[PDB]
Design a protein around this ligand. Structure first.
Ligand SMILES: [Mg+2]
Ligand SMILES: [Mg+2]
Ligand SMILES: [Mg+2]
Ligand SMILES: [Mg+2]
Ligand SMILES: [Mg+2]
Ligand SMILES: [Mg+2]
Ligand SMILES: [Mg+2]
Ligand SMILES: [Mg+2]
Ligand SMILES: [Mg+2]
Ligand SMILES: [Mg+2]
Ligand SMILES: [Mg+2]
Ligand SMILES: [Mg+2]
Ligand SMILES: [Mg+2]
Ligand SMILES: [Mg+2]
Ligand SMILES: [Mg+2]
Ligand SMILES: [Mg+2]
Ligand SMILES: [Mg+2]
Ligand SMILES: [Mg+2]
Ligand SMILES: [Mg+2]
Ligand SMILES: [Mg+2]
Ligand SMILES: [Mg+2]
Ligand SMILES: [Mg+2]
Ligand SMILES: [Mg+2]
Ligand SMILES: [Mg+2]
Ligand SMILES: [Mg+2]
Ligand SMILES: [Mg+2]
Ligand SMILES: [Mg+2]
Ligand SMILES: [Mg+2]
Ligand SMILES: [Mg+2]
Ligand SMILES: [Mg+2]
Ligand SMILES: [Mg+2]
Ligand SMILES: [Mg+2]
Ligand SMILES: [Mg+2]
Ligand SMILES: [Mg+2]
Ligand SMILES: [Mg+2]
Ligand SMILES: [Mg+2]
Ligand SMILES: [Mg+2]
Ligand SMILES: [Mg+2]
Ligand SMILES: [Mg+2]
Ligand SMILES: [Mg+2]
Ligand SMILES: [Mg+2]
Ligand SMILES: [Mg+2]
Ligand SMILES: [Zn+2]
Ligand SMILES: [Zn+2]
Ligand SMILES: [Zn+2]
Lengths: 153, 96, 25, 81, 214, 98, 127, 91
RNA sequence: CUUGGAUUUACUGAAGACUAACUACUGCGAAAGCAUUUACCAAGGACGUUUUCAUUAAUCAAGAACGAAAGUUAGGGGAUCGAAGAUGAUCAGAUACCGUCGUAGUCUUAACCAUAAACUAUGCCGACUAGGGAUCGGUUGUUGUUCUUUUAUUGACGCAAUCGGCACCUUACGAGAAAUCAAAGUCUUUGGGUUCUGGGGGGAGUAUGGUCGCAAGGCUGAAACUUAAAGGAAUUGACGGAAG
């Protein structure tokens, strides 16, 4: 609730103790229940896998990209949005990407991202048609609706 | 091309359609070939080819799904797998 | 006058009739 | 030419005509007896064959179909029937 | 007010040993100061010199070579191969009417991992006894010729280093092999490698370059 | 009435031909209709071909030619005398002038 | 033998550029245009102005040490005309007659392997 | 019989909100209430939960999709691009 | 726009378009249309055929599919050109022609629109009437030619036939008012089959009704009134800021 993007619950094994760890990822479109998700430097280029930015060739579409190494995802997290990898600078270990706003950013090549587009896109294509629809939309987001015009006060 | 050869076997020979019939036909050794649709679950697939390995039966992997495999056999339903009991006028067995 | 511009003149004048007639819809 | 024997055209000029434009249309194709070099077995083959004909004894292709007349393989001699 | 030419230092440009006349010419640059060395701002320069000049013979008058400087040793500039191109007038003199033009290109890497794009061009040849006005090849033959060009450039580049290939380009080895290989497809004339582009270079090896300079 | 049997172009058995821009006025003209002249001129005028050969550092260096293909529309070409008005019977002649 | 520069001559129909660089072309030795020799716009591309422009370039070349040049003549190119302007022929003859030695000559006019749209409109420039 | 000439599913909105908004709603609301073909079992049993969530009744496989369709065109483009870029990297 | 370094020059990068030269009285498609390579997908004409079915057909109100450009709706893109708009010129005036900017548009994805001098201003099917040289595709017989590779079973070229095309040249049996036409001929010696349209010029593709369209508009479509001409082809002349 409050999110246009669906979330995926993915279960991993703990490498050091006998326990299951459930992670909450932002679901990329095409990810299914029972799918194997591979995360790491040596992960393969498959939809839903989590890879460092340097391991992805130019033109790779990626989502939930880390702004800084290990922050677990900052960029391109809303439904239908994604990040395009523009190019690499291996000498400085840096990668150039294009953000959903159209801005180009330089990130460490060790930063991670999830291959694909965030699911739920095209949500904005439909009119809300009613004040009640917006009421229910913001009922699980925050108290920012409705807005009185300052010129009317 | 392989579709034309398979259609002749359905018209003239003997066959069973479906997972339960195929496993029975692998147990009795009456299967000459096992055809598995592309979208069949791997667990059922990896089990069907373990039965064929034990039964010494060649397996052909159809390139389409169980919707396309059914219509190739002239059926109005979905066929996830089938076994050829008697290749008749066709030479599908000679083409694997 | 040019035949092409005469057609445009009538089309613009047809447009006016429709807007004028719409008053009494 | 105002006067001309339409019923008895010159057979030389009659043969240059298209196959449908003769007095009586007649195919220019024929059937052949083909000897492959490997063995000796009469096999009747159409001159304009569309099939890769194989002799019964050994499964070796005798001819390959083309746009017009079929092309006999090397070592194969034909005699018109 | 200052005459900026009083502060310029001249350097000599040396071509690799693959060519004959290795004394290409002279260039200049702002003299080396404390803040900026002349050497670092001088590497990366590209010189375009006619191949007929690098070999003396006028038979190479229609090809012009780009030489890239990537090491400076005092007043000498150690250049490397940077690209190949035809002169504009030669190409315009080859493209006549009543004949077919066929082109092909392929991206291929050498033994030492030099990524190149190589452009091949050829024209249909009129037979000595030909009577008809035009000399056109059917599109199926052109696809086979284009296919034949690509597999020859791919084969003759990936199996050798860039220096041997440079020695291959000068006598039109690839162009002569394409003409020979397409004899059974269609008669061809003016088979040329009309342009070569360096796209990617391997990690710099000064020792390998120094071997190309004596 | 119909002035020319070719309609002033070279389109037969075709629906549409993509246009080209006139060299002189940049008017869009169909490729078959444009008056096209192929010129291969010496790059150096004949007055200067001697002193430039003497100034050449190369003994026996052949001066390159200048290759160009010019496309003109009907108004530009007629104005520039590239083509001229011919008599009613002389219009049919389409061999190159001798 | 000789010391070569590169005389990059850009001859449009409104002006004439006589530009001599080094072999790389990254270093400019002398750039005199036909517009620096006349005060009328209509003859910035005149043959007379191009000859004067070339002489100033040749004089500048001599005091720096350039004794020979290669010629790379170009027209406007791009979507516009590919034929060189009237001053390009004069600047070449003036350079040869000024004691400078001439090397290779090439046309390097920008020619498209296709073309973006050209100005003037569908109907051309109506005069 | 045919009940509505053109409004279709948007007849629930009556005369309100404007025709342009209603015909834009009709296009996307047919897509979100449709049944789609399952890529796993082959049946046409896939329906939407919330946006981006598409479940199959038969094999009980849920896949993340678009807001109003199981797959958007951008994802289909990305799927082939990733497939293509994967081939070159793995030779 | 420029000493705040313009223009120019070399090297490098990014964006969108677009496919130059090859390119033609050449090819393909129902038409609109189609020009970088390769891969994949499904089509198509012609030719060859001693294969197969046997009248299944020809043209078609109604009704469908497609339909340049421009234009509309919503995203994306927005390099270049560029309606509108703004500007510098010119002029007596110039909202224009010329010059500089420039928004929609131009590109693309989902839908709309359904019009062009959408032209060959020339319906389709069938038969016949005349010669010639070229050309594209296919097939069949044959070289003082070049080439695989040294030759064939390589491919190119050359010479003949043929079917089909895109056309062209000559003639006028014949047609036409003529310009011209191998169809615009086989029409007072008037009938092979069939679809559509016109009836002096305007008013007028206007008004109205219907119908399609978000709109712009599309399709269908009068009447009053007015008039002796309007128009086609060609001839002579006159004139032309057309050529010789
Ligand atoms: Mg955060
Ligand atoms: Mg509130
Ligand atoms: Mg408010
Ligand atoms: Mg507000
Ligand atoms: Mg108040
Ligand atoms: Mg099933
Ligand atoms: Mg009013
Ligand atoms: Mg071959
Ligand atoms: Mg006239
Ligand atoms: Mg046609
Ligand atoms: Mg048209
Ligand atoms: Mg047209
Ligand atoms: Mg013309
Ligand atoms: Mg000027
Ligand atoms: Mg100027
Ligand atoms: Mg001045
Ligand atoms: Mg002044
Ligand atoms: Mg170029
Ligand atoms: Mg502009
Ligand atoms: Mg004029
Ligand atoms: Mg009811
Ligand atoms: Mg590009
Ligand atoms: Mg062609
Ligand atoms: Mg091209
Ligand atoms: Mg109709
Ligand atoms: Mg359009
Ligand atoms: Mg359109
Ligand atoms: Mg448009
Ligand atoms: Mg838009
Ligand atoms: Mg204006
Ligand atoms: Mg004014
Ligand atoms: Mg019409
Ligand atoms: Mg026309
Ligand atoms: Mg032929
Ligand atoms: Mg014979
Ligand atoms: Mg061969
Ligand atoms: Mg061959
Ligand atoms: Mg009447
Ligand atoms: Mg009337
Ligand atoms: Mg009226
Ligand atoms: Mg309406
Ligand atoms: Mg008249
Ligand atoms: Zn045999
Ligand atoms: Zn023009
Ligand atoms: Zn399912």
């Amino acid at each position: 609730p409050g999110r246009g993007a669906p979330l995926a619950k993915v279960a991993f094994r703990d490498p050091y103790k006998y326990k299951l760890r459930e992670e909450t990822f932002i679901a990329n479109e095409g990810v299914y229940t029972g799918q194997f998700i591979y995360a790491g430097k040596k992960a393969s280029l498959n939809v839903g896998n989590i890879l460092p930015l340097g391991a992805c060739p130019e033109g790779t579409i990626v989502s939930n990209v880390e702004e800084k190494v290990g922050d677990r995802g900052a960029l391109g997290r809303t439904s239908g949005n994604y990040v395009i990898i523009i190019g690499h600078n291996p000498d400085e270990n840096k990668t150039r990407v294009k953000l959903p706003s159209g801005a180009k950013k330089i990130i460490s090549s060790d930063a991670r991202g999830v291959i694909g587009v965030v699911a739920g896109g095209g949500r904005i294509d439909k009119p809300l048609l009613k004040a009640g629809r917006a009421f229910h939309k913001y009922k699980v987001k925050r108290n920012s609706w409705p807005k009185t015009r300052g010129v009317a006060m | 091309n392989i579709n034309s050869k398979l259609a002749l076997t359905i018209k003239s020979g003997k066959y069973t359609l479906g997972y339960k019939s195929v496993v029975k036909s692998l147990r009795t050794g009456k299967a000459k070939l096992v055809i598995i649709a592309a979208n069949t679950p791997v667990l059922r697939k990896s089990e069907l080819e373990y039965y064929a390995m034990l039964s010494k039966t060649p397996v052909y992997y159809f390139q389409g799904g169980n919707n396309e495999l059914g219509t190739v056999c002239g059926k109005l339903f979905r066929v996830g797998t089938l076994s050829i009991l008697d290749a008749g006028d066709s030479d599908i067995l000679s083409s694997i | 006058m040019r035949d092409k511009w005469r057609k445009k003149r009538v089309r613009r004048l047809k447009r006016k009739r429709r807007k004028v007639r719409a008053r009494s819809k | 030419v105002l006067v001309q024997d339409l019923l008895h055209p010159s057979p030389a000029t009659e043969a240059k005509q298209h196959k449908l434009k003769t007095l009586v249309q007649q195919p220019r194709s024929f059937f052949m007896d083909v000897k492959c070099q490997g063995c000796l077995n009469i096999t009747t083959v159409f001159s304009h064959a569309q099939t890769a004909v194989t002799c019964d004894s050994c499964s070796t292709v005798l001819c390959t179909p083309t746009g017009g007349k079929a092309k006999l393989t090397e070592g194969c001699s034909f005699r018109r029937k | 007010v200052v005459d900026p030419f009083t502060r310029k230092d001249w350097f000599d440009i040396k071509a690799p040993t693959t060519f004959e006349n290795r004394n290409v010419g002279k260039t200049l640059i702002n003299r080396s100061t404390g803040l900026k060395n002349a050497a670092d701002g001088l590497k990366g320069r590209v010189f375009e010199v006619c191949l007929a000049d690098l070999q003396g013979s006028e038979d190479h008058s229609y090809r012009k070579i780009k030489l890239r400087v990537d090491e400076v040793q005092g007043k000498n500039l150690l250049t490397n191969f940077h690209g190949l191109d035809f002169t504009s007038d030669k190409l315009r003199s080859l493209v006549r009417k009543w004949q077919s033009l066929v082109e092909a290109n392929v991206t291929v890497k050498t033994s030492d991992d030099y990524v190149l794009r190589v452009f091949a061009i050829a024209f249909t040849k009129r037979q000595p006894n030909q009577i008809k006005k035009t000399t056109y090849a059917q599109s199926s033959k052109l696809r086979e010729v284009r296919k034949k060009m690509i597999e020859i450039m791919q084969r003759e580049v990936s199996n050798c280093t860039l220096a041997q290939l440079t020695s291959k380009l000068i006598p039109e080895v690839i162009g002569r092999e394409i003409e020979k290989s397409t004899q059974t497809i269609f008669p061809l004339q003016n088979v040329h490698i009309r342009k070569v582009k360096l796209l990617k270079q391997p990690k710099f090896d000064l020792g390998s370059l120094l071997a190309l300079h004596g | 009435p119909k002035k020319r049997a070719s309609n002033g172009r070279n389109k037969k058995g075709r629906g549409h031909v993509k246009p080209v821009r006139c060299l002189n006025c940049a008017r869009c003209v169909p490729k078959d209709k444009a008056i096209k002249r192929v010129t291969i001129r010496n790059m150096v005028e004949a007055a200067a071909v001697r002193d430039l050969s003497e100034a050449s550092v190369y003994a026996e260096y052949a001066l390159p030619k200048l290759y160009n293909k010019l496309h003109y529309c009907v108004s530009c070409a007629i104005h520039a005398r590239i083509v001229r008005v011919r008599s009613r019977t002389d219009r049919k002649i389409r061999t190159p002038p001798q | 033998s000789q010391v070569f520069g590169v005389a990059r001559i850009f001859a449009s129909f409104n002006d004439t550029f006589v530009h001599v660089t080094d072999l790389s072309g990254k270093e400019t030795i002398a750039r005199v245009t036909g517009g620096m020799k006349v005060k009328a716009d209509r003859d910035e591309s005149s043959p007379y102005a191009a000859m004067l422009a070339a002489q100033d370039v040749a004089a500048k070349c001599k005091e720096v040490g350039i004794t020979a040049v290669h010629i790379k003549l170009r027209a406007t190119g791009g979507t516009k005309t590919k034929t060189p302007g009237p001053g390009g022929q004069s600047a070449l003859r003036a350079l040869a007659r000024s004691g400078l030695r001439i090397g290779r000559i090439e046309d390097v006019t920008p020619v498209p392997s296709d073309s973006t749209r050209r100005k003037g409109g569908r109907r051309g420039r109506r005069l | 019989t045919k009940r509505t000439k053109k409004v279709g599913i948007t007849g629930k909105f009556g005369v309100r909100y404007g025709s342009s908004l209603r015909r834009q709603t009709k296009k996307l609301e047919v897509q979100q209430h449709a049944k789609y073909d399952c890529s796993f079992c082959g049946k046409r049993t896939v329906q939407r939960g919330a946006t981006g969530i598409w479940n199959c009744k038969s094999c009980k496989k849920t896949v993340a999709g678009g807001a109003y369709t199981v797959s958007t065109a951008a994802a289909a483009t990305v799927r082939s691009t990733i497939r293509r870029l994967r081939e070159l990297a793995e030779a």
